[PDB]
Design a binder for this molecule. Structure first.
Ligand code: 6UC
Ligand code: 6UC
Ligand code: CA
Ligand code: CA
Lengths: 219, 219, 219, 219
């Protein structure tokens, strides 16, 4: 010691205190959606946000002292740091995206409850086996997006004028969402063979993903 | 008479008789849909229904004396109870919801044929493992629906004006329903970076889905 | 009558001739589709048509002599039988539709090639173990069509005006097809609570589907 | 050095070198999609391209003499060959589709990298397994397309006027893309029974599809 409190924080009671708080501020932020609540009780709720934001700043500080540099190879906490930090840049300041960003803290419920922690851990763990198929596909999107841009962006700029648009569109087509009547039929009014681009494209991205799911499943 | 009654409820004719009426009522309920048919034979049917509802009412009565508490620890029968119960209440009474809700008694055909009861049970048995993946997704939806209401509810109130609306819109998107031409493209015209909310959202939401099944298959 | 003919049927000439003809009649049926070809060669192919069915009908008779009672408890032979008898339907205008049912004769390619029959039969083989589920749906879809026609057919006759219409509409939403912006958002404009029919309906119809496949998986 | 040239090629510096040129070109070709960029670097990169093909041209020539008959029985190099050949047409010729086909050379990143090769080589190997199914499906699409064209093309020529269109359309219905409100329901205004073609059509293409994957799964 070193630790004078170290045993707290480690303590079961204290964390669930954070967990009990998180679900509260999470409840607050929900109610903060109602314009009616914010005219009638906005005041109870702004300070409340700050108590919780203070306590959290506190709790994070405490946790770093105990763990010294070893807290910063814990992703969950790294997450807890940046997510609480996020909630600390001011509300009516510069960039209201940051105003919304502070709701990300509600994912701390995952961070503080090992079971969600366990789930998130399970899902990310299938990612490393996939990066190869993720690598091929991204290359393909990159190549076809380019072809689509050069083949169709002059007469159809909304969908294909810029590389990014071809990416966004191809993704849509990839998601198969309103792809015939929505994208290809029109295209085909001007360029009758455009199905020769799109129909194969649809085949490949669909074939691969399917087999991708099989490889996960086959133990 | 305890044994005398018990010997009645268990006969293969009682089961077949109630089942046959179920097959019959279900047919009438189908018949009840034609307003031509109603005009001509409507009266035949409004009464057959209550005749059937009574015979069914008796069956429930008979089965409870025999089983006492063992009738009410059986999930299938409780449902049977609650389904005939709801079929008890009158059309004029309250509002015309129960009047439709009554069609749920056709779920007795599942209730009464042992082959189907097995299928349902097999099916339901898949559910309990999911409560972990179920819960996580629910938190994710809650958080994101909140970010969505604050970001998009002023200019797109119908889709996102409300927590609920943001929930609805999101599931629709989750189902990938006309999500692209229908929602994100419009959003992007006011808020050009809206693809930065939905594309990731779609990823999380589709990946977790895969894994819900993989874990089902693998487990 | 057995001995004379039998020597023709099991031979490689008989089987190869019929099959290669299938491919010929299939090539020939593509062209009938272009009115340009039909105004310039229609008379050639309407009778080329006439000869294959002639060749197929005769072929059916022989195979029946040679196989006797064993012909009509063989499904593939039975199919060709049915698929040919149909192709025997009048050329002239008894009435128009059955005329289109003739292209089914291209399914003789399935019957007559052993690799495809393996596939088809393998496929059909999956059906019996699924049927208990199936029935479940048809009870489920039915209960709901009844509910749907009573709830929505008044203000929305096109989609829910008839039991049969509601079934259709209901099949559509299961396939998840333009289901929200297309169907249920409008419903909600009059009946704000329609999501209580369709969001559950969707979980259920989807739950069953996934689980149908896993049942395929274990088997 | 008709023979001995092999030791220069095949070197670890060699293979990796061609990869670095692919990545630059892959980057510079993305830049070719931009109209702004082409203004102040077009000639710099118009210059860049042909050098790469040339080098590639040089690299393909060297590798052939080293491998002789074997080079042209290497699947990855044949691609290399032809995707280089495409790039070898002149810049300002008659068919501007070829110019666009140039970016196909970014796929050499697949043939030149065994891990890329590993996924692609693995994926294709699945194909021979489905060829019995693919022939089946293509036979099935062909049959229903014929039927569609004779059935709906006169009143709906845009969608069914011709075989190809019916193919496209049928392919569309099969991705279930806007099929109902988009394709079938309109049909039904004129041909009330069209769901009888399409709902069965849907079951079948979905049935074969799902089961195809399960076979992939078990194997
Ligand atoms: C925060 C709880 O979720 C909701 O706010 C909603 C309810 C609350 O009931 C929840 C019923 N639940 C079991 C599906 N109905 C469901 C169903 C919705 C939803 O988005 O479904 C996922 C929304 C809603 C949708 C459409 C119009 C208004 C509103 Br309010
Ligand atoms: C036929 C697609 O239906 C699905 O439910 C699947 C989704 C989509 O379901 C969730 C809702 N969705 C439309 C986003 N992801 C894709 C990619 C799948 C596929 O392999 O077919 C292309 C299947 C699937 C998911 C999980 C486990 C096994 C399978 Br088979
Ligand atoms: Ca759509
Ligand atoms: Ca859709």
């Amino acid at each position: 010691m070193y630790l004078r409190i170290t045993n707290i924080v480690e303590s079961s009671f204290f964390t669930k205190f954070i967990i009990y708080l998180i679900v509260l501020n999470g409840i607050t932020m929900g109610l903060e959606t109602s314009k009616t609540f914010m005219q009638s009780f906005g005041v109870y709720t702004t300070l409340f946000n700050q108590i919780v934001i203070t306590i959290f700043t506190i709790e994070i500080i405490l946790r770093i002292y105990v763990h010294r540099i070893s807290f910063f190879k814990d992703p969950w906490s790294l997450f807890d740091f940046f997510v609480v930090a996020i909630s600390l840049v001011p509300t009516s300041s510069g960039f209201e995206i940051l105003r919304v960003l502070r709701v990300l803290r509600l994912f701390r419920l995952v961070t503080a409850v090992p079971q969600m922690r366990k789930i998130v851990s399970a899902l990310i763990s299938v990612i490393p086996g996939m990066l190869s198929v993720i690598a091929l596909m991204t290359l393909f999107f990159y190549i076809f997006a380019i072809m689509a841009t050069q083949l169709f962006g002059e007469r159809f700029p909304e969908w294909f004028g810029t590389l990014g648009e071809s990416f966004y569109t191809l993704f849509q087509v990839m998601t198969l969402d309103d792809w015939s009547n929505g994208i290809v039929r029109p295209l085909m009014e001007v360029y009758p063979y455009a199905y020769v681009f799109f129909i194969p494209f649809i085949f490949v991205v669909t074939f691969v993903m399917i087999n991708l799911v099989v490889a996960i499943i086959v133990d």
